[PDB]
Structure 1
């Protein structure tokens, strides 16, 4: 189907012209006011940012001159009956030239020109928000008529006025009585009268601009009353401010148990603070990042980016940066490379912080791991890189067989003093220390003088089998190692073997003899056990039986096995129930029984007919 008219036959003959790009202002205004912001409340944020920029410019101008500092405040006002919202400022202001150059031209901002002509861009380039030049036109999205009063702080400037309706035309006049600074008056739409209500405005202000750098008022009462401590050095801020900030951000009533104050500028500008709660995690904590992203003291509202890995969703705090790329809508540029490196840097720093906490305090870290271990266990099984899994795995605490009861140990220190020339790590799963010590599998391997890691928590064998390796060493379970490893008369032993294969033929594949058991009359061995256990309870005897191949062993030294001889010689019917009970007990001890409700009736029958002579 190769039919390509693509060629280079084109050739230029006529004289080349020369033109300049134009623009359609009405369509640009319509696009800005209709299809730019997904929410209608952002105009308050934009106006507050503009007021903050004006105040910052005035403050810098006065500081560079060494003059006295007047008051620097933002004043919001709402009039319910008139349906208007008013924001006042005490910044630099602007004359009619700046009025018609900035408010009359799309995508032109004087703040960028101010920053460029500063020659330092250190003291003030970190405190100016405006960079695009279209933020003022969001007021037309909720208004039908905008009215602005302003006058410059220069000694001899006069007031002015600025009216528009968002219809591609604006009129400028000269006004008297204007207070120095800038004042914006907004007349609201019919369908946007909700913004004349004090509660809605307060909610928006607290959601977006709580940490503005200047005092802010709404109808007369100050709303800041709280310093952004993440911008200060740790040596200046006390613990009371830390706990109050944690109380504010976490919406809790307890104290933080861990506090990290992170400030870095080499790879990228990062100023963040992190908290770990004092209570235990709950159902909502497991349910679905609780960390707010900021940029020059303005919320970005990611709510989907998850700048922090999912398994770290239990920590709280704020993250602030100056170099994140944000689009024209003042939202994150989704899945940029900078975000993907910020996440890795932050998670590595958090891992390093958690590792160091163990050294300086052991009991507190043990309690924290007891509380928040499930998050680390989940983080093991969702990562992909082996290095990440090994980094997280250093936080796990286990109980070993070479140490006294009730004290923990780590994998790294487990590998410290293990056998000189064996690249193997052995772990056993049991609900208790008592069940781990007297487990048939542990007895079967107790001959070897190796240290076994007892793990009691749930979803732990799953974590080990997804880890598969630590410091280039294999993680081998005791159950697998037993099969990997390579009295009663023999005539009666073999005859009872034949009988057991006869009776338990359908459920059991093979029977063997074992001298490695001393306190358990039976044991069930499968070629693999951890994966079988995990698979069994996601999904009656048979359809589970051929999926396991339950090899069963017998202990000739046990008393019950010995008595089974003469209880079959005397009454085969009782032995019929006895062997089934032994098999059920062995399968229960192996941990392969999901719901043991089935065996209750047969156990009752065996008990009621076994001792009837007594």
Structure 2
């Protein structure tokens, strides 16, 4: 029964006091430097972001005041002997009260205040990175003492000094000889001395700060060399630049078969490039030219993970650890827009180049099939379904058709789409479920790839037309002499073959095999790898055999049945084997090799 203690017999009989929220700083520093960032290496990323923000501030101030632009670069210095990493820029710089307000206060960012006083949102609002005010304190998880030397770019400002150890106290002083900008000296912790190595610093800078708007120098060498091609015009960027850019973001060496430069910003300011790898079997997320996460499996659907590239947006919501605010109230709109655009782009690619898209299909067909089954909204499934290509009975072999054009030639009277799932076209065209509708002039799609039977049930509908599985619907030998041959073949092949029938549509093949139970035909293929014992093969599927008397081999078996019964008994098994191979029910015909080899030696005994 009901059991609750919630009640409203409670009132207020006190005096309304006025307390302002407090915040102890020791635990805040401990949280920032111990339990805020997943990886220890992001401190140089945050420092480079601060340097880039300072350089952007100086550039904006200079262009607003209308004078020359001096050298503005970020210099990373690493001294292995001293165990220190030094970052220095030529940004705006910071004064006494500026240092006290920005560096000495948690969550207080001067970048946000500068952005609020910009009132244009077009000059540098999309380039200022800092928004939280805790980025600098990420340097304390690697350093036992941080030395910051800054001097404002104002005409007359004096240099200052900033010492701290992360214990809630910082000793700011006065320094002379400070060059314009900010010079941050970091003395690494005993357990964090590995950041005093040039290799690690270069690796982290390439991982995070490879696309900084300003020159980045590590030990005196410029090492950015990547001008963020996702930010320029799609027509201005050449195709050759896309080749190495894909090799960088995807960490591959091949070429991209497709390249989509998406820049339309209806929901969010998106500057993204999407690549499709050539290697038949994961998009980098960026915010203001700073990497957020490499995998970024949240912005794109799981079935779209096969594409590579970059997605850059300056309006995405970021976590305090500068990572993606996954499953935010706003990110889901971006996922649908990206998903619809790629589907629209793929559809356009199919029309522009059918053969290229057809080749592209089997490389990543399992991804589209995965999308339909894992999709929740039915309308979403219809979008991916437009990307599917299938072979049709009314169209010759080797060419594929999509669902949309299949319904284009669909009869007006009928309302449902018929699809048949078979290992290959040859066996599909002979199944009795297929010619059941061949009496009428209907058209059926032939399904070949695996998991394709799985997705059609989940799709269950296309363009208001239901998908109906066909399975669930339900010169020549004399006639007299051919029949007596049929009875003999039903004795020697009694177990394997249910019945043998005459075929009038053969030119050079002595015999094929036909199945009644395509549901169990795939069972035969899956058991080829394991437990393909010949004796048990007959009971599993019970294959049916069809032959033509016009063939020479069939015409030869007439005399072989009596003159050489031993050779005939081995040849009829061999003819059955080739029928199995031609229809594709057997992947590797290793079993027939042993019997074929001994068949040939007595096939030439009189030569």
> Which residue, 545, 549, 565 being the options, matches 1:572?
565
Gap regions ≥5 residues in structure 2:
none
Answer yes or no: is the 8 Å Cα contact 2:430–2:514 preserved in 1. no
User: TM-score, structure 1 length as denominator?
Assistant: 0.80
Q: Quote how far apart the aligned CAs of 1:310 are.
A: 2.5
Offset from partner CA, 1:530-562 (integer Å, 9 cap, x none) = 377369837989999998799999999999999
Answer yes or no: is the 8 Å Cα contact 1:522–1:552 preserved in 2. yes
Offset from partner CA, 1:144-166 (integer Å, 9 cap, x none) = 11111111111121111111122
Paired residue secondary structure (1:476) = strand
Moved more, 579-588 or 453-462: 579-588
Give me the whole-angstrom Cα distance separating, in 1, the residues matched to 2:104 and 2:250: 43
Paired residue secondary structure (2:275) = strand
Q: Quote how far apart the aligned CAs of 1:430 are.
A: 5.6
Q: Quote how far apart the aligned CAs of 1:565 are.
A: 14
| CA 1:258–1:517: 2 relative to 1, 3 Å | closer
Offset from partner CA, 1:338-370 (integer Å, 9 cap, x none) = 232222211110000111112223333333235
Cα RMSD (Å): 4.8
Gap regions ≥5 residues in structure 1:
282-289
Offset from partner CA, 1:474-509 (integer Å, 9 cap, x none) = 444555555xxx999999999999999999999999
| CA 1:9–1:490: 2 relative to 1, 3 Å | same
Q: Quote how far apart the aligned CAs of 1:82 are.
A: 1.1
Cross-structure match for 1:435: 427
Paired residue secondary structure (2:324) = coil
Give me the whole-angstrom Cα distance separating, in 2, the residues matched to 1:497 and 1:4: 82
| CA 1:175–1:448: 2 relative to 1, 3 Å | same
| CA 1:561–1:476: 2 relative to 1, 3 Å | farther
Offset from partner CA, 1:559-612 (integer Å, 9 cap, x none) = 999999999999999999999999999999998889988899999999999999
Offset from partner CA, 1:210-235 (integer Å, 9 cap, x none) = 00011110111101122111112223
Offset from partner CA, 1:99-153 (integer Å, 9 cap, x none) = 1111111121122121122222332221111111111112221111111111111
Offset from partner CA, 1:444-485 (integer Å, 9 cap, x none) = 765444444344444444444544433333444555555xxx
Moved more, 508-517 or 270-279: 508-517
Paired residue secondary structure (2:441) = coil
Answer yes or no: is the 8 Å Cα contact 1:444–1:516 preserved in 2. no
Paired residue secondary structure (1:611) = coil
Answer yes or no: is the 8 Å Cα contact 1:480–1:527 preserved in 2. no
Answer yes or no: is the 8 Å Cα contact 2:211–2:227 preserved in 1. yes
Give me the whole-angstrom Cα distance separating, in 2, the residues matched to 1:464 and 1:453: 11
| CA 1:48–1:602: 2 relative to 1, 3 Å | closer
Answer yes or no: is the 8 Å Cα contact 1:440–1:517 preserved in 2. no
Cross-structure match for 1:5: 5
| CA 1:582–1:139: 2 relative to 1, 3 Å | closer
| CA 1:353–1:39: 2 relative to 1, 3 Å | same
Answer yes or no: is the 8 Å Cα contact 1:461–1:530 preserved in 2. no
Offset from partner CA, 1:78-107 (integer Å, 9 cap, x none) = 111111111111111111111111111112
Answer yes or no: is the 8 Å Cα contact 1:444–1:517 preserved in 2. no
Q: Quote how far apart the aligned CAs of 1:299 are.
A: 0.7
Answer yes or no: is the 8 Å Cα contact 1:88–1:182 preserved in 2. yes
Q: Quote how far apart the aligned CAs of 1:32 are.
A: 1.6
> Which residue, 532, 540, 548 being the options, matches 2:533?
540
Give me the whole-angstrom Cα distance separating, in 2, the residues matched to 1:192 and 1:137: 16
Answer yes or no: is the 8 Å Cα contact 1:480–1:529 preserved in 2. no
Moved more, 120-129 or 365-374: 365-374
| CA 1:186–1:458: 2 relative to 1, 3 Å | same
Answer yes or no: is the 8 Å Cα contact 1:302–1:332 preserved in 2. no
Offset from partner CA, 1:375-434 (integer Å, 9 cap, x none) = 334434443443333222222333434334543333322222233322344445566665
Give me the whole-angstrom Cα distance separating, in 1, the residues matched to 2:448 and 2:4: 69
Paired residue secondary structure (1:330) = coil
Moved more, 360-369 or 213-222: 360-369
Paired residue secondary structure (1:191) = helix
| CA 1:134–1:575: 2 relative to 1, 3 Å | same
Paired residue secondary structure (1:569) = coil
Give me the whole-angstrom Cα distance separating, in 1, the residues matched to 2:138 and 2:108: 15
Give me the whole-angstrom Cα distance separating, in 1, the residues matched to 2:548 and 2:414: 31
Q: Quote how far apart the aligned CAs of 1:203 are.
A: 0.6
Q: Quote how far apart the aligned CAs of 1:55 are.
A: 0.9
Moved more, 595-604 or 112-121: 595-604
Q: Quote how far apart the aligned CAs of 1:241 are.
A: 2.8
Moved more, 204-213 or 602-611: 602-611
Say how many residue pairs are matched: 603
Q: Quote how far apart the aligned CAs of 1:76 are.
A: 1.0
| CA 1:382–1:554: 2 relative to 1, 3 Å | farther
Does 2:228 match 1:228? Answer: yes
| CA 1:136–1:432: 2 relative to 1, 3 Å | closer
Moved more, 237-246 or 505-514: 505-514
Give me the whole-angstrom Cα distance separating, in 1, the residues matched to 2:196 and 2:594: 73
| CA 1:476–1:594: 2 relative to 1, 3 Å | farther
Cross-structure match for 1:264: 264
Moved more, 121-130 or 557-566: 557-566
Moved more, 453-462 or 270-279: 453-462
Paired residue secondary structure (1:398) = strand
Give me the whole-angstrom Cα distance separating, in 2, the residues matched to 1:224 and 1:45: 13
| CA 1:418–1:303: 2 relative to 1, 3 Å | closer
Give me the whole-angstrom Cα distance separating, in 2, the residues matched to 1:413 and 1:130: 51
| CA 1:142–1:252: 2 relative to 1, 3 Å | closer
> Which residue, 458, 466, 477 being the options, matches 1:466?
458
Paired residue secondary structure (1:37) = coil
Answer yes or no: is the 8 Å Cα contact 2:423–2:584 preserved in 1. no
| CA 1:534–1:375: 2 relative to 1, 3 Å | farther
